[PDB]
Structures are given as structure tokens and as C-alpha cells.
Amino acid sequence: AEVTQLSNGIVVATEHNPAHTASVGVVFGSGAANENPYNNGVSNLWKNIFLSKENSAVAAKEGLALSSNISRDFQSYIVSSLPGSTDKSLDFLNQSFIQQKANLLSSSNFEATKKSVLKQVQDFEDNDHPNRVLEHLHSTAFQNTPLSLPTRGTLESLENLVVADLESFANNHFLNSNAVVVGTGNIKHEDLVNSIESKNLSLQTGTKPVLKKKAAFLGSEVRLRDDTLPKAWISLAVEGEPVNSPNYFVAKLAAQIFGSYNAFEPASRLQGIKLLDNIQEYQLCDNFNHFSLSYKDSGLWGFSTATRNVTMIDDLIHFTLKQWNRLTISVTDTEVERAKSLLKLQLGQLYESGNPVNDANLLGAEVLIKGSKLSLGEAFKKIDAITVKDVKAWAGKRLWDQDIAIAGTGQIEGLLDYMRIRSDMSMMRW
Amino acid sequence: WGGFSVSNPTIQRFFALHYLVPFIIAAMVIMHLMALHIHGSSNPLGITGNLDRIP
Ligand code: HEM
């Protein structure tokens, strides 16, 4: 458990633990939330040439493995080494992001990569209905606002993208003040920071990105009815918490109370979740899962679900929203306590997997926003300190009689109108 | 009439009948709503309503 971050000319962040391999990468503070409607998908395209057969063979000769991830707030390019080769990873990083960042964009490479992210993003829209729905949830929830842009980009902005768009983006966002270099694995801080302060040369230092306009939640829906699909997939959310919200953890705990479910897993049917008494009688769904998604400016708190019970979708939604009503008025001590324990377990399994590439992404994203990483033991202190009173005060502000955002696809004829769903965000009282 | 002309018998039985028939109308309204329910309302376009219902 370590967090050593220090700024030379660039900002260097590491977290070392004797494991096996080491992962080095640069993580930029700009993602799909920084694109336009019209160059949407430029980051995903950058990712895909960085992993192209040409660049990927040059790394595999050296015994290096490549990894990249496009998100909303950020963007990361990562090389995993075998831990004494922690220097030959920094060679491949700079040989790409200074030298080859004019050789990767060759006409034959770009056209074969663009053709591959087109088959890629098309395949997504055709078949991945849960993530497709969740992506459209962000699209309508945050419409005409940076968080609405999908991470993979749209088929139409993608096929109209040229080399100059990659260039213009790279020249405005792959800057020094919008970068953090991250090392996870087992390698020391002073083992890496010296290999970085070895070579100087700043490259476009002093240049800031471009500013924008703030993200906002708009209560709304997008309904992607398709009667030929064998199920209905729906996601429903309120405006949640940004990272570095006081209620960052209260929100995450609230989502753990209702948790996630899988009708076919015997153990899942037995969880201490009151909602399960309602939904199992007539089998109202195959699965659901609650989430508290947090970004820089905003977040989404809600749930997603999939079902073949297409004539009782209204009972699914009704029982789920009646449970959420309880958070404001009647959530019990032992529900909160169950959530604490399970939130710790899952937050643990995230922050300490046996895979440094995940560690890098979690470290990178955190330090880009607040300039530091809160340690796992520090989180548990915050989690344990949450009372029933906290959850109630949170839910009464975020959940009770608040606008929602809805998205769905498949057989959603039985998903009732907006106002019916929205009325269930509260209860009648004297 | 209950006699030779419209008289007391007539008005007393017409009150009794006036009280009754509203309840038969009520039962016929239920039969009216039963037939309405199996096919639903029509609409101003004169075509199917099946593609877009609201509660
Ligand atoms: C006490 C009398 C009646 C009651 C309470 C009644 C009630 C209703 C109700 C609630 C509806 C649905 C809403 C509407 O379309 O307005 C309806 C539909 C209808 N009623 Fe009546 N009704 C009465 C008398 C009649 C009469 C006298 C006729 C015709 C001779 C009639 C013909 C219809 C028809 C054809 C419809 C369907 C209209 C459509 O959907 O296009 N009703 N009625």
C-alpha cells in the first residue's frame, strides 16, 4: 500500500508492491468528454493505432505488452514489462509519443485501423445491448453536454475522420500539463523518476488544452424499441455524485444496498436484499445491477436490468423504485451494515487485483482529478463512518421526487411512459 | 293507465318505474363498457391504436 506522486517537469505517480510484472504508461486528462459531436471517436481511434500490428510487433520483439483504455474524463496508454525491463518500456513510450507519432499515421496503417474500429463499433451497436443501453443512458441524461458523447464514438463521426483530426486532437490534449506518467507493478518511485529525469526535452510545454462548458443532467429518455430482440434491457438513473463529492461513498453504499442479481445463480437468490422478495415470485427479470458512476463534473446513480418477462416490466420498475423510496424514509441499520461490508469487499477486489494494468488505470484517473490517491484503508474509514442518517439525507436530496433518465432496447412496449416512472420516485403522505 | 284515463294509478306507477329504470341503465352502461374494453377506443385517424398506447 503506497502512493508516491512527485512533479519534476512532468507529474510522476507510482504505487509499488512486490508482485511479478511492472506496468508503465502515460494517462492524459482528456477523454471522450473533450471531443465534439463531429470528431467523436478520435480518442478510440488513437487507442487503436497505438495497438496496431505495426506498433504491437515492435513491442513484442522487445518482450513488451500493450494496453490502452478510453474513458470519459481521461485516456491512457500503457506498456507492461518484466520488471527489470522498466527502462525498455520508457523507451517504447517515447519512441512512440515523439518519434513514431508521425510514423504511426501512415496511409495504409490508418485505413486498415479505421476499417477495424468501424467493424468494431458496428458490432457493438448490433449486439452488445446492455452496454449499448448504458451508453445511450449517458447520451440522453447528459445531452448537448460533454458527458453525452460515447467513448467508442459514433459510426458517422468515425467514418468521416481523417489523419488531421487525430493530429489536431493530439496537439491539443497530449500536452504536458494534461499528462501524468504512471508506474505500477513492483518498481520503485526513484527507480522510475530518475529514468524520466534522465532525458530532458519538454515538448510543447506551456500549452494548455481548450476550455469548454459544464456538464448537466437533464431528466429525459431514449427508447430504442426492437421487437425482434428476445429480451428487454433497461437502465434508469438519477443525477449521482462527481468524484471528490462529500457523498461519493454514501452514494456507492446506497447502490450496494440493492446490489446486483442473477436469477440463475442459486447464491444470488439468497442475498439480504428486500427487493428480491418482490421480484422472484413472478420472476420479473433475469438480472439487474445498481451502480454509482462518478465523473469529474457529475455522475449517475441508478440500475440496469434485463428481462424476458415482457408483460410485467411495469412491476419490475415499480418494485425497484419503491425500494429506492425506502432510502429516504425507512432504510434499516442492518441494511446499511450489510452494505458497508460488501462495499469494502468489492472496493478491495478492485484496488488490489493481481493485475497492474488495472492498478495503473485506477491510480492514473484518481491523481488526474484530485492530485492524489486516497488509500484503501482511508476509504474504509470513510465507509465505516456512514450512518443511516447520512443515507437518508443523501437519498432525500438525490432520489426523492427527482427527475430520472431512462434508456432501453428490445421488447420495451411494456415499459410505461415517463411520468408513470417519474411519479414512483416518491410516495403519498398525510 | 290502470283505468279509464291518466289518473292516480298512472302517476304512482310512473314514479315507481322512474325510480327503477336508471338502475337498468346502469347495468347497460356496464355492458357498454365491457364491449368497449375488449377492443378499446378508436381514434380520430380511424386506424389502429396498437402501435402507440399511453395509460
Ligand atoms: C349513459 C350513456 C352512455 C355512457 C355512460 C357511455 C360511456 C362511454 C364511454 C366511457 C366510452 C369511452 C370514451 C368515449 O369514447 O367517449 C364510450 C364509447 C362509445 N360509446 Fe358510449 N356511452 C353511453 C351511451 C352511448 C350511446 C347512446 C351510444 C350510441 C348510440 C354510444 C356509443 C359508443 C361508441 C360507439 C363508443 C366508441 C367510440 C370510439 O372509441 O370511437 N354510447 N361510451
Tab-separated table of C-alpha atoms in Angstrom, chain A:
chain	number	residue	atom	x	y	z
A	1	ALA	CA	0.000	0.000	0.000
A	2	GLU	CA	1.809	3.076	-1.254
A	3	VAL	CA	1.105	6.382	-3.013
A	4	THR	CA	4.218	8.301	-4.123
A	5	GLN	CA	3.497	11.183	-6.514
A	6	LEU	CA	6.053	13.943	-7.246
A	7	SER	CA	6.324	16.548	-10.028
A	8	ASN	CA	9.602	17.242	-11.875
A	9	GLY	CA	8.777	18.950	-15.121
A	10	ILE	CA	6.127	16.265	-15.695
A	11	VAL	CA	3.990	14.720	-12.922
A	12	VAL	CA	5.060	11.175	-11.964
A	13	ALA	CA	2.881	8.801	-9.915
A	14	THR	CA	3.741	5.300	-8.702
A	15	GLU	CA	2.479	2.553	-6.391
A	16	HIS	CA	4.792	-0.413	-5.890
A	17	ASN	CA	4.231	-3.855	-4.361
A	18	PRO	CA	6.445	-6.938	-4.981
A	19	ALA	CA	4.230	-8.913	-7.365
A	20	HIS	CA	5.714	-10.096	-10.671
A	21	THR	CA	5.486	-7.646	-13.575
A	22	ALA	CA	5.588	-3.852	-13.906
A	23	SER	CA	3.319	-1.541	-15.890
A	24	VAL	CA	4.323	1.873	-17.205
A	25	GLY	CA	2.091	4.329	-19.005
A	26	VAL	CA	1.015	7.892	-19.650
A	27	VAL	CA	-2.509	8.904	-18.664
A	28	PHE	CA	-3.915	12.091	-20.235
A	29	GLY	CA	-6.540	14.255	-18.529
A	30	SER	CA	-8.808	14.313	-21.567
A	31	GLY	CA	-11.186	11.708	-22.954
A	32	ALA	CA	-14.418	11.409	-24.940
A	33	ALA	CA	-15.813	14.222	-22.795
A	34	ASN	CA	-13.362	16.518	-24.602
A	35	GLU	CA	-14.367	15.573	-28.143
A	36	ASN	CA	-17.046	17.173	-30.356
A	37	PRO	CA	-20.172	15.627	-31.885
A	38	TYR	CA	-18.240	15.656	-35.146
A	39	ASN	CA	-14.790	14.324	-34.234
A	40	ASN	CA	-16.351	11.902	-31.729
A	41	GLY	CA	-14.294	8.721	-31.793
A	42	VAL	CA	-10.866	10.283	-32.308
A	43	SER	CA	-9.590	9.032	-28.942
A	44	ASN	CA	-10.788	5.489	-29.635
A	45	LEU	CA	-9.007	5.676	-32.983
A	46	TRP	CA	-5.790	6.862	-31.316
A	47	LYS	CA	-6.016	3.877	-28.968
A	48	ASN	CA	-6.400	1.520	-31.901
A	49	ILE	CA	-3.323	2.550	-33.889
A	50	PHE	CA	-1.275	2.534	-30.677
A	51	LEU	CA	-2.202	-1.168	-30.598
A	52	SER	CA	-1.867	-1.715	-34.361
A	53	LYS	CA	0.000	-4.741	-35.736
A	54	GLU	CA	2.920	-2.485	-36.701
A	55	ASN	CA	3.439	-0.853	-33.299
A	56	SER	CA	2.481	-4.049	-31.471
A	57	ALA	CA	5.119	-6.205	-33.191
A	58	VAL	CA	7.866	-3.695	-32.353
A	59	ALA	CA	6.887	-4.113	-28.690
A	60	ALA	CA	6.557	-7.913	-28.813
A	61	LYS	CA	10.098	-8.294	-30.174
A	62	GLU	CA	11.326	-6.429	-27.088
A	63	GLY	CA	9.079	-8.609	-24.920
A	64	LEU	CA	6.641	-5.803	-24.080
A	65	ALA	CA	2.823	-5.959	-23.894
A	66	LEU	CA	0.489	-3.135	-24.916
A	67	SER	CA	-2.730	-1.875	-23.309
A	68	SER	CA	-4.958	1.176	-23.752
A	69	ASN	CA	-8.250	2.486	-22.353
A	70	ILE	CA	-10.512	5.340	-23.482
A	71	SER	CA	-12.829	6.765	-20.822
A	72	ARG	CA	-14.888	9.933	-20.471
A	73	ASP	CA	-12.661	12.133	-18.293
A	74	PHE	CA	-9.316	10.602	-19.244
A	75	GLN	CA	-7.244	8.460	-21.592
A	76	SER	CA	-4.391	6.019	-21.011
A	77	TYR	CA	-1.594	4.327	-22.961
A	78	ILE	CA	0.149	1.532	-21.088
A	79	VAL	CA	3.048	-0.881	-21.576
A	80	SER	CA	3.608	-3.874	-19.298
A	81	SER	CA	7.183	-5.094	-18.795
A	82	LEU	CA	9.045	-7.862	-16.960
A	83	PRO	CA	10.132	-5.969	-14.089
A	84	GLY	CA	13.826	-5.385	-14.784
A	85	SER	CA	12.877	-4.060	-18.230
A	86	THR	CA	11.288	-0.995	-16.590
A	87	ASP	CA	13.647	1.113	-18.729
A	88	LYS	CA	12.825	-0.511	-22.078
A	89	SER	CA	9.155	0.371	-21.530
A	90	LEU	CA	10.025	4.064	-21.237
A	91	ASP	CA	11.959	3.675	-24.498
A	92	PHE	CA	8.849	2.373	-26.255
A	93	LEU	CA	6.713	5.148	-24.744
A	94	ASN	CA	8.948	7.940	-26.074
A	95	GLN	CA	9.815	6.187	-29.346
A	96	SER	CA	6.045	6.269	-29.919
A	97	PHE	CA	4.938	9.609	-28.444
A	98	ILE	CA	7.720	11.699	-30.013
A	99	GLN	CA	9.344	9.734	-32.843
A	100	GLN	CA	6.620	7.407	-34.135
A	101	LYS	CA	3.754	9.853	-33.504
A	102	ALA	CA	4.449	10.887	-37.102
A	103	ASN	CA	5.032	7.343	-38.407
A	104	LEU	CA	2.022	5.553	-36.891
A	105	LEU	CA	-0.292	7.678	-39.024
A	106	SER	CA	0.830	6.203	-42.359
A	107	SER	CA	-1.824	5.966	-45.082
A	108	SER	CA	-2.017	2.157	-45.180
A	109	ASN	CA	-1.958	1.795	-41.383
A	110	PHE	CA	-4.684	4.388	-40.787
A	111	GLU	CA	-7.056	2.939	-43.399
A	112	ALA	CA	-6.701	-0.611	-42.054
A	113	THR	CA	-7.255	0.630	-38.495
A	114	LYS	CA	-10.244	2.833	-39.380
A	115	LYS	CA	-11.729	-0.186	-41.166
A	116	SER	CA	-11.268	-2.193	-37.949
A	117	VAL	CA	-12.825	0.260	-35.489
A	118	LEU	CA	-15.748	0.528	-37.897
A	119	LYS	CA	-16.403	-3.220	-37.768
A	120	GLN	CA	-15.752	-2.816	-34.037
A	121	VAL	CA	-18.204	-0.037	-33.185
A	122	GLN	CA	-20.796	-1.516	-35.547
A	123	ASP	CA	-20.549	-4.906	-33.812
A	124	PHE	CA	-21.120	-3.121	-30.500
A	125	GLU	CA	-24.323	-1.404	-31.642
A	126	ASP	CA	-25.632	-4.587	-33.276
A	127	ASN	CA	-25.063	-6.980	-30.363
A	128	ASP	CA	-23.931	-5.533	-27.017
A	129	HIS	CA	-27.337	-4.442	-25.788
A	130	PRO	CA	-26.573	-3.876	-22.082
A	131	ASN	CA	-23.596	-1.564	-22.715
A	132	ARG	CA	-25.342	-0.079	-25.743
A	133	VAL	CA	-28.245	0.859	-23.450
A	134	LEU	CA	-25.921	2.183	-20.731
A	135	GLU	CA	-24.079	4.299	-23.302
A	136	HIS	CA	-27.380	5.783	-24.541
A	137	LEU	CA	-28.279	6.462	-20.893
A	138	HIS	CA	-25.303	8.860	-20.707
A	139	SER	CA	-26.301	10.195	-24.098
A	140	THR	CA	-29.780	11.322	-23.018
A	141	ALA	CA	-29.011	12.049	-19.361
A	142	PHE	CA	-26.259	14.475	-20.345
A	143	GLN	CA	-27.473	15.561	-23.802
A	144	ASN	CA	-25.741	18.510	-25.529
A	145	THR	CA	-23.045	18.376	-22.874
A	146	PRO	CA	-19.601	16.686	-22.761
A	147	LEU	CA	-20.636	13.520	-20.885
A	148	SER	CA	-23.156	12.613	-23.617
A	149	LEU	CA	-20.500	11.589	-26.149
A	150	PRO	CA	-19.933	7.814	-26.345
A	151	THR	CA	-16.382	6.545	-25.752
A	152	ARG	CA	-16.143	4.432	-28.904
A	153	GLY	CA	-17.541	7.308	-30.956
A	154	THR	CA	-20.439	7.107	-33.426
A	155	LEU	CA	-20.337	5.327	-36.802
A	156	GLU	CA	-20.893	8.612	-38.641
A	157	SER	CA	-18.257	10.763	-36.967
A	158	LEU	CA	-15.881	7.798	-37.241
A	159	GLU	CA	-16.092	7.154	-40.992
A	160	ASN	CA	-15.613	10.871	-41.685
A	161	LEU	CA	-12.442	11.095	-39.590
A	162	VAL	CA	-9.063	11.888	-41.178
A	163	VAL	CA	-5.383	11.901	-40.127
A	164	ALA	CA	-5.558	15.654	-39.466
A	165	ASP	CA	-8.282	15.137	-36.826
A	166	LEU	CA	-6.057	12.698	-34.930
A	167	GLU	CA	-3.301	15.305	-35.282
A	168	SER	CA	-5.342	18.306	-34.120
A	169	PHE	CA	-6.605	16.361	-31.097
A	170	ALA	CA	-3.127	15.054	-30.213
A	171	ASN	CA	-1.767	18.611	-30.485
A	172	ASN	CA	-4.357	19.997	-28.065
A	173	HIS	CA	-4.647	17.255	-25.439
A	174	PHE	CA	-1.489	15.118	-25.478
A	175	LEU	CA	0.233	18.039	-23.742
A	176	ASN	CA	2.446	18.120	-20.651
A	177	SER	CA	0.017	19.968	-18.365
A	178	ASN	CA	-2.649	17.421	-19.349
A	179	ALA	CA	-0.496	14.371	-18.610
A	180	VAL	CA	0.544	12.072	-15.785
A	181	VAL	CA	3.086	9.268	-16.104
A	182	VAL	CA	2.103	6.240	-14.052
A	183	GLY	CA	4.020	3.196	-12.898
A	184	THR	CA	2.548	0.210	-11.098
A	185	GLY	CA	3.916	-3.273	-10.524
A	186	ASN	CA	6.885	-3.608	-8.177
A	187	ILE	CA	9.239	-0.875	-9.410
A	188	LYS	CA	10.261	1.914	-7.011
A	189	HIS	CA	9.400	5.606	-7.347
A	190	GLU	CA	13.074	6.594	-7.529
A	191	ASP	CA	13.658	3.713	-9.949
A	192	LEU	CA	11.325	5.363	-12.473
A	193	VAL	CA	11.548	9.093	-11.719
A	194	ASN	CA	15.306	9.035	-12.382
A	195	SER	CA	14.886	7.290	-15.746
A	196	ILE	CA	12.439	10.101	-16.562
A	197	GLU	CA	14.621	12.984	-15.336
A	198	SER	CA	17.444	11.259	-17.247
A	199	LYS	CA	16.248	12.615	-20.593
A	200	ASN	CA	15.077	16.229	-20.633
A	201	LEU	CA	13.312	17.847	-23.629
A	202	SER	CA	9.847	19.098	-22.662
A	203	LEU	CA	7.893	19.003	-25.965
A	204	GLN	CA	5.049	21.556	-26.175
A	205	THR	CA	5.357	22.656	-22.543
A	206	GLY	CA	3.446	25.795	-21.587
A	207	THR	CA	0.498	24.856	-23.804
A	208	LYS	CA	-2.894	24.402	-22.122
A	209	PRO	CA	-5.838	22.462	-23.648
A	210	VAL	CA	-9.094	24.164	-24.628
A	211	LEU	CA	-11.783	25.044	-22.072
A	212	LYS	CA	-15.484	24.210	-22.539
A	213	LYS	CA	-18.952	24.351	-20.902
A	214	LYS	CA	-20.052	22.367	-17.822
A	215	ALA	CA	-21.908	19.041	-17.820
A	216	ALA	CA	-25.560	18.949	-16.729
A	217	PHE	CA	-28.174	16.273	-16.027
A	218	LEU	CA	-31.433	16.551	-17.944
A	219	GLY	CA	-34.338	14.292	-16.982
A	220	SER	CA	-35.293	12.501	-20.180
A	221	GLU	CA	-35.439	9.196	-22.049
A	222	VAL	CA	-34.400	7.466	-25.261
A	223	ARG	CA	-36.387	4.388	-26.250
A	224	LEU	CA	-34.746	2.045	-28.755
A	225	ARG	CA	-37.662	-0.353	-29.266
A	226	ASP	CA	-36.776	-3.527	-31.126
A	227	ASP	CA	-39.390	-6.299	-31.025
A	228	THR	CA	-37.039	-8.787	-32.723
A	229	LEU	CA	-34.688	-8.963	-29.727
A	230	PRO	CA	-35.595	-11.770	-27.278
A	231	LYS	CA	-35.387	-9.545	-24.167
A	232	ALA	CA	-35.781	-6.023	-22.810
A	233	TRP	CA	-32.707	-4.204	-21.480
A	234	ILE	CA	-33.259	-1.045	-19.494
A	235	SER	CA	-31.177	1.407	-17.471
A	236	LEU	CA	-32.596	4.100	-15.218
A	237	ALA	CA	-30.721	6.688	-13.167
A	238	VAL	CA	-30.805	9.956	-11.269
A	239	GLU	CA	-28.004	12.537	-11.171
A	240	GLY	CA	-25.361	10.952	-8.956
A	241	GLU	CA	-22.077	12.177	-7.478
A	242	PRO	CA	-18.877	13.507	-9.067
A	243	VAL	CA	-15.534	12.176	-7.791
A	244	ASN	CA	-14.475	14.303	-4.810
A	245	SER	CA	-18.051	14.694	-3.651
A	246	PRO	CA	-18.599	14.529	0.137
A	247	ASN	CA	-21.262	11.920	-0.646
A	248	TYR	CA	-19.040	9.924	-3.011
A	249	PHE	CA	-19.132	6.997	-0.598
A	250	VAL	CA	-22.705	7.407	0.668
A	251	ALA	CA	-23.824	7.058	-2.966
A	252	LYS	CA	-21.681	3.980	-3.588
A	253	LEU	CA	-23.008	2.390	-0.378
A	254	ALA	CA	-26.631	3.144	-1.349
A	255	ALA	CA	-26.057	1.235	-4.588
A	256	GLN	CA	-24.647	-1.725	-2.663
A	257	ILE	CA	-27.828	-1.963	-0.578
A	258	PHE	CA	-29.734	-3.094	-3.687
A	259	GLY	CA	-26.636	-4.569	-5.255
A	260	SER	CA	-26.750	-6.864	-8.238
A	261	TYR	CA	-28.620	-10.034	-9.083
A	262	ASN	CA	-28.623	-13.072	-11.358
A	263	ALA	CA	-31.736	-15.262	-11.334
A	264	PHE	CA	-29.871	-18.382	-12.434
A	265	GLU	CA	-27.196	-18.329	-9.697
A	266	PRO	CA	-28.611	-20.111	-6.580
A	267	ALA	CA	-26.483	-17.999	-4.231
A	268	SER	CA	-27.728	-14.759	-5.784
A	269	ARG	CA	-31.357	-15.583	-4.968
A	270	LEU	CA	-30.400	-15.727	-1.282
A	271	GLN	CA	-28.869	-12.291	-0.728
A	272	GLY	CA	-30.060	-9.992	2.043
A	273	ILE	CA	-31.908	-7.703	-0.352
A	274	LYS	CA	-35.580	-6.919	0.337
A	275	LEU	CA	-36.267	-6.237	-3.337
A	276	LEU	CA	-35.716	-9.950	-4.055
A	277	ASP	CA	-38.871	-10.977	-2.193
A	278	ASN	CA	-40.862	-8.934	-4.727
A	279	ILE	CA	-39.144	-9.812	-7.960
A	280	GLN	CA	-38.723	-13.576	-7.552
A	281	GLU	CA	-42.397	-14.505	-7.143
A	282	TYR	CA	-43.201	-13.982	-10.854
A	283	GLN	CA	-39.546	-13.750	-11.932
A	284	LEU	CA	-39.561	-10.128	-13.008
A	285	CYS	CA	-36.056	-10.217	-14.504
A	286	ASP	CA	-33.040	-12.320	-15.385
A	287	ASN	CA	-30.659	-9.790	-13.863
A	288	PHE	CA	-30.170	-6.309	-12.515
A	289	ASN	CA	-27.248	-4.351	-11.114
A	290	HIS	CA	-27.083	-0.987	-9.385
A	291	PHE	CA	-24.227	1.472	-9.933
A	292	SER	CA	-22.874	4.773	-8.736
A	293	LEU	CA	-20.969	6.118	-11.725
A	294	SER	CA	-18.796	9.125	-10.882
A	295	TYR	CA	-17.009	11.507	-13.253
A	296	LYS	CA	-15.283	14.888	-12.936
A	297	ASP	CA	-18.372	17.092	-13.272
A	298	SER	CA	-21.226	14.718	-12.449
A	299	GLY	CA	-22.405	11.133	-12.128
A	300	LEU	CA	-25.294	8.696	-12.487
A	301	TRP	CA	-26.918	6.693	-9.684
A	302	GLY	CA	-29.386	4.021	-10.754
A	303	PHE	CA	-29.700	0.468	-12.024
A	304	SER	CA	-29.698	-1.602	-15.196
A	305	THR	CA	-31.706	-4.729	-15.843
A	306	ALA	CA	-32.504	-7.416	-18.403
A	307	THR	CA	-35.745	-9.434	-18.658
A	308	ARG	CA	-37.770	-11.925	-20.717
A	309	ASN	CA	-40.891	-11.160	-18.698
A	310	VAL	CA	-42.126	-8.617	-21.176
A	311	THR	CA	-45.673	-8.265	-19.838
A	312	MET	CA	-44.590	-7.366	-16.292
A	313	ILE	CA	-41.872	-4.797	-16.900
A	314	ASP	CA	-44.047	-2.296	-15.021
A	315	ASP	CA	-43.846	-4.418	-11.860
A	316	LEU	CA	-40.060	-4.653	-12.197
A	317	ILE	CA	-39.785	-0.854	-12.336
A	318	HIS	CA	-42.424	-0.273	-9.665
A	319	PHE	CA	-40.962	-2.615	-7.028
A	320	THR	CA	-37.411	-1.366	-7.669
A	321	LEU	CA	-38.437	2.289	-7.287
A	322	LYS	CA	-40.500	1.564	-4.152
A	323	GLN	CA	-37.375	0.030	-2.610
A	324	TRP	CA	-35.385	3.175	-3.527
A	325	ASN	CA	-38.103	5.241	-1.814
A	326	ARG	CA	-37.129	3.486	1.390
A	327	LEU	CA	-33.666	5.107	1.454
A	328	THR	CA	-35.271	8.443	2.360
A	329	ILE	CA	-37.692	7.147	4.950
A	330	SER	CA	-37.113	3.636	6.335
A	331	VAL	CA	-33.744	2.059	5.454
A	332	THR	CA	-32.601	-0.072	8.416
A	333	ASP	CA	-29.302	-0.228	10.356
A	334	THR	CA	-28.596	-3.777	9.280
A	335	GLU	CA	-29.110	-2.950	5.583
A	336	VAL	CA	-26.521	-0.172	5.893
A	337	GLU	CA	-24.162	-2.505	7.784
A	338	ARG	CA	-24.548	-5.254	5.174
A	339	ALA	CA	-23.668	-2.693	2.507
A	340	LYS	CA	-20.567	-1.460	4.348
A	341	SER	CA	-19.132	-4.974	4.482
A	342	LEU	CA	-19.900	-5.719	0.836
A	343	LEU	CA	-18.713	-2.304	-0.377
A	344	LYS	CA	-15.354	-2.940	1.337
A	345	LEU	CA	-15.094	-6.379	-0.233
A	346	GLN	CA	-15.764	-5.111	-3.748
A	347	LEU	CA	-13.668	-1.958	-3.387
A	348	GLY	CA	-10.869	-4.196	-2.171
A	349	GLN	CA	-11.206	-6.592	-5.117
A	350	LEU	CA	-10.919	-3.549	-7.407
A	351	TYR	CA	-7.982	-1.685	-5.868
A	352	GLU	CA	-5.965	-4.850	-5.264
A	353	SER	CA	-6.333	-7.279	-8.117
A	354	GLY	CA	-3.263	-9.203	-9.249
A	355	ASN	CA	-3.104	-7.071	-12.398
A	356	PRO	CA	-1.018	-3.857	-12.527
A	357	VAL	CA	-2.718	-2.522	-15.676
A	358	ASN	CA	-5.921	-2.093	-13.645
A	359	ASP	CA	-3.884	-0.509	-10.845
A	360	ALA	CA	-2.425	1.979	-13.323
A	361	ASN	CA	-5.858	2.980	-14.637
A	362	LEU	CA	-7.210	3.425	-11.105
A	363	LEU	CA	-4.120	5.365	-9.995
A	364	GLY	CA	-3.997	7.437	-13.172
A	365	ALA	CA	-7.640	8.528	-13.141
A	366	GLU	CA	-7.544	9.422	-9.442
A	367	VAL	CA	-4.392	11.573	-9.453
A	368	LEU	CA	-5.508	13.429	-12.589
A	369	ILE	CA	-8.580	14.781	-10.777
A	370	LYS	CA	-7.619	15.411	-7.136
A	371	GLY	CA	-3.825	15.326	-7.414
A	372	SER	CA	-3.544	12.292	-5.116
A	373	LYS	CA	-4.912	8.819	-4.405
A	374	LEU	CA	-6.922	8.037	-1.274
A	375	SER	CA	-5.541	4.801	0.201
A	376	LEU	CA	-7.752	1.718	0.529
A	377	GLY	CA	-7.507	1.908	4.318
A	378	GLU	CA	-8.538	5.564	4.227
A	379	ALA	CA	-11.664	4.658	2.236
A	380	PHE	CA	-12.689	2.011	4.782
A	381	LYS	CA	-12.503	4.693	7.465
A	382	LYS	CA	-14.969	6.805	5.462
A	383	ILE	CA	-17.200	3.827	4.671
A	384	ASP	CA	-17.455	2.696	8.303
A	385	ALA	CA	-18.400	6.204	9.427
A	386	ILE	CA	-21.617	6.321	7.379
A	387	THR	CA	-24.844	6.297	9.402
A	388	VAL	CA	-28.472	5.622	8.453
A	389	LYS	CA	-28.904	9.374	8.886
A	390	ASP	CA	-26.347	10.012	6.142
A	391	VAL	CA	-28.002	7.705	3.591
A	392	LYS	CA	-31.397	9.298	4.338
A	393	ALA	CA	-30.097	12.847	3.906
A	394	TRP	CA	-28.435	11.808	0.653
A	395	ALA	CA	-31.462	9.983	-0.776
A	396	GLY	CA	-33.760	12.841	0.216
A	397	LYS	CA	-31.673	15.109	-1.997
A	398	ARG	CA	-30.789	12.848	-4.920
A	399	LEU	CA	-33.570	10.236	-5.118
A	400	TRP	CA	-36.800	11.640	-3.653
A	401	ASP	CA	-39.092	13.350	-6.183
A	402	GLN	CA	-36.192	13.905	-8.585
A	403	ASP	CA	-36.046	13.677	-12.364
A	404	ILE	CA	-34.775	10.448	-13.885
A	405	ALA	CA	-33.159	9.398	-17.122
A	406	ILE	CA	-34.225	6.251	-18.954
A	407	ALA	CA	-32.874	4.193	-21.851
A	408	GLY	CA	-33.958	0.844	-23.238
A	409	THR	CA	-33.914	-1.535	-26.189
A	410	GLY	CA	-35.586	-4.789	-27.171
A	411	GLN	CA	-39.193	-5.600	-26.252
A	412	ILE	CA	-39.940	-2.470	-24.197
A	413	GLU	CA	-43.607	-1.961	-25.154
A	414	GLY	CA	-44.433	-2.750	-21.522
A	415	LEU	CA	-42.114	-0.065	-20.136
A	416	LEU	CA	-44.662	2.579	-19.248
A	417	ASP	CA	-44.464	6.306	-20.039
A	418	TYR	CA	-42.013	8.684	-18.412
A	419	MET	CA	-44.435	10.324	-15.969
A	420	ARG	CA	-45.526	6.964	-14.573
A	421	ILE	CA	-41.920	6.041	-13.843
A	422	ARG	CA	-41.198	9.527	-12.506
A	423	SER	CA	-44.209	9.534	-10.143
A	424	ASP	CA	-42.774	6.451	-8.436
A	425	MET	CA	-39.775	8.494	-7.241
A	426	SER	CA	-41.873	9.223	-4.139
A	427	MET	CA	-44.873	8.196	-2.035
A	428	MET	CA	-48.164	9.718	-0.889
A	429	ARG	CA	-48.109	11.025	2.710
A	430	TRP	CA	-50.535	12.683	5.134
